[PDB]
Amino acid sequence: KEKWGVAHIYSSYNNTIIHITDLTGAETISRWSGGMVVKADRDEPSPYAAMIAARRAAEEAMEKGITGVHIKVRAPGGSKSKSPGPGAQAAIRALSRAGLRIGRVEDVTPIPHDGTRPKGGRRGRRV
RNA sequence: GGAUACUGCGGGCCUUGGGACCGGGAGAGGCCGGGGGUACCCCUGGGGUAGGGGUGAAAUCCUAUAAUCCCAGGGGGACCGCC
């Protein structure tokens, strides 16, 4: 029989997390970060690191018996940035190549109807 | 002593300036009461294993008394995105 899961991707300017669950999101299957596959902190969001972690997670999922997968991609959002990083697309293509079938794709970046104050300081960062 | 255009004083008239009223509409004008929208933070439960965050690069910091991440619930305070 064909079973479907869900891949949550959390992408940032500093790391990428790929997490595969069942359709309910209450049972976890695999979880891999860009910091498990490199040793430089400045490479955690490299799309190659993302590809590698995606491959590991996909192979573990297949071993567990997962065939299809829906996708929810996310940036931190809220008061932080609303734009994903560059590892998300890499991870998606890597999941496709690993051998899983892909279903729906959606963005779930949480966005403020009007909310809290960000960290700048009325003048932002000045480096 | 004389004159009466202008100004002042006294008395009548006018509607052009201003004010009052009727009508159908506009608008984030103000105050009061009620109902909501996402997001964020804390707590409690379930899943899961080793890093998460952060930078020009890093480290102080959180983490094995189980973090980041995913799910189900409870509470609280500010704000009202796109249009």
From Swiss-Prot:
Domain of life: Archaea
GO cellular component terms, A-Z: cytosolic small ribosomal subunit
Alphabetical list of Gene3D superfamilies matching this protein: Ribosomal protein S11 (3.30.420.80)
Entry keyword annotation includes Phosphoprotein: no
A GO MF label: rRNA binding
InterPro entries in the cross-refs: Ribosomal_uS11, Ribosomal_uS11_archaeal, Ribosomal_uS11_CS, Ribosomal_uS11_sf
Function of the protein: Located on the platform of the 30S subunit.
Family listed: Belongs to the universal ribosomal protein uS11 family.
HAMAP family attached to this UniProt entry: Ribosomal_uS11
Oligomeric form and interacting partners: Part of the 30S ribosomal subunit.
Name of the protein in question: Small ribosomal subunit protein uS11
